[PDB]
Amino acid sequence: SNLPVEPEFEQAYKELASTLENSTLFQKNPEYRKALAVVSVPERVIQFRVVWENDKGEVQVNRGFRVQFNSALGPYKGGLRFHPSVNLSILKFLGFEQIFKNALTGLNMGGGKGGSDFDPKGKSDSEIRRFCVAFMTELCRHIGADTDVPAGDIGVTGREIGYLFGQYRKLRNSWEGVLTGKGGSWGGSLIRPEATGYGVVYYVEHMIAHATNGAESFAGKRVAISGSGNVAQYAALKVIELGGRVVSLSDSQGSLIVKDTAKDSFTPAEIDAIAALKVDRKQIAELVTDAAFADKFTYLPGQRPWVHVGAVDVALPSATQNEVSGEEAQALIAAGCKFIAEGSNMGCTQAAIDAFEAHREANKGAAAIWYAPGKAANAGGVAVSGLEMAQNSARLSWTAEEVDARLKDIMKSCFQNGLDTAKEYATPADGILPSLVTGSNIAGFTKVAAAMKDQGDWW
Amino acid sequence: SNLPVEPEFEQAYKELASTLENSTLFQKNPEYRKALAVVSVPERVIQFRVVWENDKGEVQVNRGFRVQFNSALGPYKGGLRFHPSVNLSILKFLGFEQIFKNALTGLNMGGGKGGSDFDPKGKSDSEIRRFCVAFMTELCRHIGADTDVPAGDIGVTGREIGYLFGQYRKLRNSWEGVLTGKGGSWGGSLIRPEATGYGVVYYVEHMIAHATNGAESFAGKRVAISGSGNVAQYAALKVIELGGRVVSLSDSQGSLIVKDTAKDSFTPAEIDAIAALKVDRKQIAELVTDAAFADKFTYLPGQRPWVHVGAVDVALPSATQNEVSGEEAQALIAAGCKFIAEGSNMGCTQAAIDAFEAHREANKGAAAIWYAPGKAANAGGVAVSGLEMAQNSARLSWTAEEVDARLKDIMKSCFQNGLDTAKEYATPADGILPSLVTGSNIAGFTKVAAAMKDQGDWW
Amino acid sequence: SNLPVEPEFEQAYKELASTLENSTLFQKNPEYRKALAVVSVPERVIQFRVVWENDKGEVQVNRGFRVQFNSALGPYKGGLRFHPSVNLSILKFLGFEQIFKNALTGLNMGGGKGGSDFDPKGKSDSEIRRFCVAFMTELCRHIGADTDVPAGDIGVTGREIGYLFGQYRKLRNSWEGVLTGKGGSWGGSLIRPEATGYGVVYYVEHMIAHATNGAESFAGKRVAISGSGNVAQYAALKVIELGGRVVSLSDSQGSLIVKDTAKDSFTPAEIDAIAALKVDRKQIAELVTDAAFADKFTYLPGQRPWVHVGAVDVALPSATQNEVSGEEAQALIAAGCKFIAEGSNMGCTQAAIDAFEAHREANKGAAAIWYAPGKAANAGGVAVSGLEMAQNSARLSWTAEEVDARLKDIMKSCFQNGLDTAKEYATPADGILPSLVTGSNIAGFTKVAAAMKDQGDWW
Amino acid sequence: MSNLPVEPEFEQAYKELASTLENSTLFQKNPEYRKALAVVSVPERVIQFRVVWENDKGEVQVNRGFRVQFNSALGPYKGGLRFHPSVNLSILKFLGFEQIFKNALTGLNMGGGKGGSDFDPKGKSDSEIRRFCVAFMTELCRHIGADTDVPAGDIGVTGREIGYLFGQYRKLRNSWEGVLTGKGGSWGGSLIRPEATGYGVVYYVEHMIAHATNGAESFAGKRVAISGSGNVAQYAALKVIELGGRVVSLSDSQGSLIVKDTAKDSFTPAEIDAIAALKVDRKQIAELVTDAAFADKFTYLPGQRPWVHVGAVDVALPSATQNEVSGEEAQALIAAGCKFIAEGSNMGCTQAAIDAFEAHREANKGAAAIWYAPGKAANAGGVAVSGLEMAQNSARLSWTAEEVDARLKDIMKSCFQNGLDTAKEYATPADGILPSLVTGSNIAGFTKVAAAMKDQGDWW
Ligand SMILES: NC(=O)C1=CN([C@@H]2O[C@H](COP(=O)(O)OP(=O)(O)OC[C@H]3O[C@@H](n4cnc5c(N)ncnc54)[C@H](OP(=O)(O)O)[C@@H]3O)[C@@H](O)[C@H]2O)C=CC1
Ligand SMILES: NC(=O)C1=CN([C@@H]2O[C@H](COP(=O)(O)OP(=O)(O)OC[C@H]3O[C@@H](n4cnc5c(N)ncnc54)[C@H](OP(=O)(O)O)[C@@H]3O)[C@@H](O)[C@H]2O)C=CC1
Ligand SMILES: NC(=O)C1=CN([C@@H]2O[C@H](COP(=O)(O)OP(=O)(O)OC[C@H]3O[C@@H](n4cnc5c(N)ncnc54)[C@H](OP(=O)(O)O)[C@@H]3O)[C@@H](O)[C@H]2O)C=CC1
Ligand SMILES: NC(=O)C1=CN([C@@H]2O[C@H](COP(=O)(O)OP(=O)(O)OC[C@H]3O[C@@H](n4cnc5c(N)ncnc54)[C@H](OP(=O)(O)O)[C@@H]3O)[C@@H](O)[C@H]2O)C=CC1
The minimal CB distance from D3 to the residues C34, C43, C87 is found for C87
Which C-chain residues 207-226 have CB contacts (< 8 A) with chain A?
A: none
User: Could you tell me the sign of the dihedral formed by the alpha carbons of D151, D152, D154, D158, in that order?
Assistant: positive
Q: Which atom of ligand 3 is nearest to the CA of C379?
A: 47
Instruction: Round to whole Å and give the CA distance between B138 and B106.
Output: 31
CA distance A86 to B15: 27
Q: In this complex, which chains have at least 3 CB pairs below 8 Å with chain B? A: A, C
**Breaks in chain B after residues, C-to-N cutoff 2.5 Å:** none
C450 backbone dihedrals φ, ψ, rounded to 5°: -65, -50
Maximal CA-CA distance, chain D: 68
Could you give the CA distance from residue B376 to residue B419 in angstroms, rounded to a whole number?
11
**Cα torsion at C147, C152, C158, C160 (round to 10°)?**
-80
How far from A23 is each of A314, A418, B50, B202, D191, CA to CA, in Å? 28, 13, 29, 65, 57
Cα–Cα distances (Å) from A230 to A190, A287, D322, in that order, read 15, 19, 49
Q: Is B224 left (phi over 0), alpha (psi -120 to 50) or beta?
A: beta
Number of H helices and E strands in chain D, helices first, is: 16, 13
Give B20's contacts (C-beta < 8 A, 6+ positions apart).
Answer: B26, B32, B36, B441, B442, B445
Cα B245 to Cα B227: distance, rounded to the nearest angstrom: 16
Look at residues C127, A65, A134 and name the one whose alpha carbon lies nearest to residue B459.
C127
Q: Name the E strands within D55-142.
A: 60-71, 77-78, 81-83, 112-117
Tell me which of C92, C113, C375, C447 is the catalytic residue: C113
Task: Give the DSSP H/E element, type plus range, for residue D142.
Answer: none
Contact indicator for C187, B108 with CB cutoff of 8 Å: yes
Contact (CB, 8 A) for D45 and C45: no
Min CA distance, B41 vs chain A (Å)? 6
User: Cβ neighbours of residue B312 under 8 Å, at least 6 residues apart?
Assistant: B222, B223, B224, B247, B261, B332, B335, B336, B337
**Are D107 and A186 within 8 A, CB to CB?**
no
**Closest CA relative to residue D383, chosen from D106, D44, D184:** D106
DSSP secondary structure code for residue B144 in this structure: B
**Nearest chain C residue (CA) to B446:** C185
User: What is the Cα–Cα distance from D183 to D146, expressed in whole angstroms?
Assistant: 14
Residues after which chain D is broken (C–N above 2.5 A) are none
C-alpha distances (whole Å) from B134 to each of A141, A459, B167, B183, B286 are 22, 15, 9, 21, 32
User: Rounded to 10 degrees, what is the CA torsion of B137, B139, B145, B147?
Assistant: 140
Indicate left, alpha or beta for C226 from its phi (over 0: left) and psi (-120 to 50: alpha). Answer: beta
Q: Are D162 and D183 in contact (CB under 8 A)?
A: yes
State the Cα–Cα distance between residues B351 and C387, nearest whole angstrom. Answer: 49
CATH number of D297's domain: 3.40.50.720
Pocket of ligand 1 (CB under 6 A): A 83, 152-155, 196, 227-232, 251-252, 278, 283, 318-321, 343-345, 378, 381
Give the up-direction half-sphere exposure of residue A86: CA atoms within 13 A in the CB hemisphere.
Answer: 28
Ligand with an atom nearest the CA of residue D383? 4
A282/A12 Cα distance (integer angstroms): 31
SS3 D353: helix
Residue D209: which of D378, D362, D43 has the closest Cα? D378
Say whether the C–D interface has 3 or more Cβ pairs within 8 Å.
yes
CA distance D277 to D257: 16
Four-residue CA torsion sign, A231, A234, A236, A242: negative
D342: number of Cβ within 10 Å? 28
Pairing type for strands A339-341 and A314-316 reads parallel
Q: Whose CA is nearest to atom 18 of ligand 3?
A: C229
One-letter amino acid of B118: F
Nearest to B349 by CA among B314, B378, B317: B317
* Of B399, B453, B443, the residue nearest B39 (C-alpha): B453
How far apart are the C-alpha atoms of C200 and C197, rounded to whole Å?
A: 5
Cα pseudo-dihedral C259, C263, C268, C270, rounded to 10: -10
- Taking a C-beta distance cutoff of 8 angstroms, is the pair B51, A458 a contact? yes
Q: Give me the residue from C37, C117, C459 closest to D3, CB to CB.
A: C117
Distance CA C195, CA C176 (A): 21
Q: Are D218 and D259 in contact (CB under 8 A)?
A: no
- Range 152-191 of C in CB contact (< 8 A) with A: 170-171, 173
DSSP H helices, C40-157, are 88-104, 125-139
Rama region for C276: left / alpha / beta (φ>0; ψ in -120 to 50; rest)? alpha
d(CA B208, CA B201): 10
C238 alpha-carbon distance from chain centroid: 16
Phi, psi of D294 (to 5 degrees): -80, -40
Ligand lying closest to the C-alpha of residue D237: 4
Chain B residues whose beta carbon lies within 8 Å of the beta carbon of residue C176? 146
Nearest to B2 among A41, A85, A459 (CB): A85
Q: Nearest CA of chain C to the CA of D269: how many Å?
A: 36
DSSP 8-state symbol, B313: S
Atom from ligand 3 closest to the CA of residue C343: 8
DSSP-based three-state secondary structure for A63: strand
Interface check C125 vs A, CB under 8 A: no
**Are A372 and A402 contacting, i.e. CB atoms less than 8 angstroms apart?**
no
CB A181 within 8 A of CB A385: yes
Chain A CA closest to residue C134: A170
The reported resolution of this PDB entry, expressed in Å, is 2.9
The helix/strand/coil state of A299 is strand
DSSP secondary structure code for residue B85 in this structure: T
Q: Using a 6 Å CB cutoff, which residues line ligand 2? A: B 83, 152-155, 196, 227-232, 251-252, 278, 283, 318-321, 343-345, 378, 381
Q: How far is residue D235 from each of residues D196, D267, D317, D340, measured CA to CA in Å?
A: 8, 12, 12, 18
Q: Say whether D253 counts as a known binding-site residue.
A: yes
Task: Tell whether C138 is within 8 A of chain A (Cβ).
Answer: yes
Residue range(s) defining the domain that contains residue D255: 195-378
Structure determined by: X-ray
Q: Nearest to residue C188, comparing CAs of B409, B451, B443, B444?
A: B451
Closest Cα partner for A228 from A256, A250, A248?
A: A250
With a CB cutoff of 8 Å and minimum separation 6, the contacts of D116 are D65, D66, D80, D81, D82, D83, D84, D87, D92, D154, D156, D157
CA distance A177 to chain C (A): 21
| Close Cβ partners of D245 (under 8 Å, ≥ 6 residues apart) | D219, D220, D221, D222, D223, D224, D266, D315
CB contact under 8 A, D49 and C43: yes
Residue nearest to atom 7 of ligand 3 (CA): C344
Burial letters for A66-84: b for 16+ Cβ neighbours within 10 Å, e otherwise?
Answer: bbbbbbbbbbbbbbbbbbe
Q: Which helix (H) or strand (E) holds D105?
A: helix D89-106
Is A91 in a helix, a strand, or coil? helix
B95 and B111 Cβ atoms separated by less than 8 Å: yes
φ, ψ of residue D163 in degrees (nearest 5)? -55, -45
> What does the radius of gyration of chain D's CA atoms come to, in whole angstroms?
21
Q: Residue B289's CB: how many other CB atoms inside 10 A?
A: 9
CA distance D148 to C249: 50
Per-residue burial over B110-139, b = 16 or more CB atoms within 10 Å of its CB, e = otherwise: bbbbbbbbbebeebeeebbbbbbbbbbbbb
